[PDB]
Curated annotation (Swiss-Prot):
Detected in umbilical vein endothelial cells. Proteolytic processing gives rise to a soluble extracellular domain that is detected in blood plasma (at protein level). Predominantly expressed in endothelial cells and their progenitors, the angioblasts. Has been directly found in placenta and lung, with a lower level in umbilical vein endothelial cells, brain and kidney. It comes from Homo sapiens. Changing C211Y: In GLC3E; enhanced proteasomal degradation. This is Angiopoietin-1 receptor. Belongs to the protein kinase superfamily. Tyr protein kinase family. Tie subfamily. It is found in: Cell membrane; Cell junction; Cell junction, Focal adhesion; Cytoplasm, Cytoskeleton. Disulfide bonds join C22-C80, C189-C198, C202-C211, C205-C218, C220-C229, C233-C242, C246-C252, C258-C265, C267-C276, C280-C289, C293-C301, C295-C307, C309-C318, C348-C402. Tyrosine-protein kinase that acts as a cell-surface receptor for ANGPT1, ANGPT2 and ANGPT4 and regulates angiogenesis, endothelial cell survival, proliferation, migration, adhesion and cell spreading, reorganization of the actin cytoskeleton, but also maintenance of vascular quiescence. Has anti-inflammatory effects by preventing the leakage of pro-inflammatory plasma proteins and leukocytes from blood vessels. Required for normal angiogenesis and heart development during embryogenesis. Required for post-natal hematopoiesis. The chain holds residues 23 to 445 of 1124 of the full protein. Homodimer. Heterodimer with TIE1. Interacts with ANGPT1, ANGPT2 and ANGPT4. At cell-cell contacts in quiescent cells, forms a signaling complex composed of ANGPT1 plus TEK molecules from two adjoining cells. In the absence of endothelial cell-cell contacts, interaction with ANGPT1 mediates contacts with the extracellular matrix. Interacts with PTPRB; this promotes endothelial cell-cell adhesion. Interacts with DOK2, GRB2, GRB7, GRB14, PIK3R1 and PTPN11/SHP2. Colocalizes with DOK2 at contacts with the extracellular matrix in migrating cells. Interacts (tyrosine phosphorylated) with TNIP2. The gene is TEK. Proteolytic processing leads to the shedding of the extracellular domain (soluble TIE-2 alias sTIE-2). Glycans are attached at N118, N136, N377, N416.
Length: 423
């Protein structure tokens, strides 16, 4: 009910057209998806109204496209929000002149409340004048004329939540419309910790997924899925259940994905660099190609999925044996149900080797509500969660969804429920 993905079709702007697509994956939003300028993220921004149209190539998705070469001052922090039952899901990104004097090095960067941050921009144009690094509008750092190095950094020792935000960089004689932008995302808890008091141990996320401080659950990079981000998805896909496909004969090449906040932006698995147009050198494979393969026996290292193990061996480095994993599978779920108003007790049934446990099965209502099982049991090799709805009413009828997520991956199956009242 909350799998929103913003696609920043090239964060570096030039003469070609650039866009921003906000996508709802596997759920009909019940409140308008929003796309616009994030004035709080960066001040002194222009206020031209954005033209937001429906992207007819992805079910539920909205996009903003900027007229080729009419790509005037569109530099700035943007965002696309999704509202689900009172909760807002926000994802942010920025746009900047490709012609820039300094390039951002990285679009966004995530650190822990402890972490000693090191914000850096790469020098592109050599001008004989002072270089400055701002933050939204205020001063942060400054470098003297004849001493502006090949890499312009700001050192943030012991980064705190307040240190998060958009960091600008440019030569003193410039302006906002010509700065380089970088977003620092600071988790409110230290590494592996989560909870209202950072009192809990996160789910170990592999393949560069990050742990959400308010849930302990992982947000995986495009191309992987499963509770711990270890399931390599089908080649050019994205979305929590990997049911979205990068349009184009070139995969997800020129696509930049930004996911819900604790994660930020990055390339899909197998690609790197701003623009994400660069493939990976041998031995690497995750998002922005930061993962180093280490296949214990020299097994193939695929830039998208990682180590390609031989018969009998699973795992990130082909270090495990035993029963091989099986992605969950929703079995025996009708396309329609038709039920009368009153007590309702639906069941979702799933298979898979790591057999879904009770904490991994949920039923999502058309309006986003997420229900947990009330009773549970598993047969020979099928998990069965049973849900209880006090009094299902007529308006609640729509497309409900069974959701199962384990280390073998995640799956969702939709079924249409019709509710009428007995005469
Ligand atoms: C008003 C202004 O231009 N500054 C905003 C400020 O409102 C906000 O508290 C801060 C938080 O990101 O962002 C900017 O600094
Ligand atoms: C096949 C299996 O073991 N499932 C049983 C099912 O027979 C029954 O309807 C339910 C009772 O609440 O318990 C489990 O779901
Ligand atoms: C939510 C949806 O997919 N709409 C269909 C609706 O058109 C159809 O009339 C009903 C019963 O026939 O099933 C679903 O509700
Ligand atoms: C109220 C109702 O259920 N009718 C809808 C009808 O509007 C639509 O044309 C058809 C196609 O999906 O589905 C259902 O028949
Ligand atoms: C950031 O710069 C400091 C200062 O030299 C350095 O000690 C630190 O390792 C850098 N951070 C990293 C690891 O990129």
């Amino acid at each position: 009910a909350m799998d929103l993905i913003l696609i920043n079709s090239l964060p570096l702007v030039s003469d070609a057209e650039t866009s921003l697509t906000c996508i709802a994956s596997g759920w009909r939003p019940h409140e308008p998806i929003t796309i616009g300028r994030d004035f709080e993220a960066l001040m002194n921004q222009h206020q031209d109204p954005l033209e937001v149209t429906q992207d007819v190539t992805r079910e539920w998705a909205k996009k903003v496209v900027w007229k080729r070469e009419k790509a005037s001052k569109i530099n700035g922090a943007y965002f696309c929000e999704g509202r689900v039952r009172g909760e807002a899901i926000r994802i942010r990104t920025m746009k900047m002149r490709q012609q820039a004097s300094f390039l951002p090095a990285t679009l966004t960067m995530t650190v822990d409340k402890g972490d000693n941050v090191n914000i850096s921009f790469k020098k592109v144009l050599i001008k004989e004048e002072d270089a400055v690094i701002y933050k939204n509008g205020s001063f942060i750092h400054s470098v003297p004329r004849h001493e502006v190095p090949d890499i312009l950094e700001v050192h943030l020792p012991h980064a705190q939540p307040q240190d998060a935000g958009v960091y600008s960089a440019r030569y003193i004689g410039g302006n906002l419309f010509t700065s380089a932008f970088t977003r620092l995302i600071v988790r409110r808890c230290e590494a592996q910790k989560w909870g209202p008091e950072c009192n809990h141990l996160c789910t170990a996320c592999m393949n560069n997924g990050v742990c959400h401080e308010d849930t302990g659950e992982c947000i995986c990079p495009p191309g992987f899925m499963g509770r711990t981000c270890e399931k390599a998805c089908e080649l050019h896909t994205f979305g929590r259940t990997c049911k979205e496909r990068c349009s184009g004969q070139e995969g997800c090449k020129s696509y930049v994905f930004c996911l819900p906040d604790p994660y930020g932006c990055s390339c899909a698995t197998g690609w790197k660099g701003l623009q994400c147009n660069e493939a990976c050198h041998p031995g690497f494979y995750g998002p922005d190609c930061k993962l180093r393969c280490s296949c214990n026996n020299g097994e193939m290292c695929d830039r998208f999925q990682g180590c390609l193990c031989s018969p009998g061996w699973q795992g990130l480095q082909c270090e495990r044996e035993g029963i091989p994993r099986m992605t969950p599978k929703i079995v025996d779920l009708p396309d329609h149900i038709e039920v009368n108003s009153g007590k309702f007790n639906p069941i979702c049934k799933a298979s898979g080797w790591p057999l879904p446990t009770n904490e991994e099965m949920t039923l999502v209502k058309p309006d986003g509500t997420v229900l947990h099982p009330k009773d549970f049991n598993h047969t020979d090799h099928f998990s069965v969660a049973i849900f209880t709805i006090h009094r299902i009413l007529p308006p609640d009828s729509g497309v409900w969804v069974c959701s199962v997520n384990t280390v073998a991956g995640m799956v969702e199956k939709p079924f249409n429920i019709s509710v009428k009242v007995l005469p």
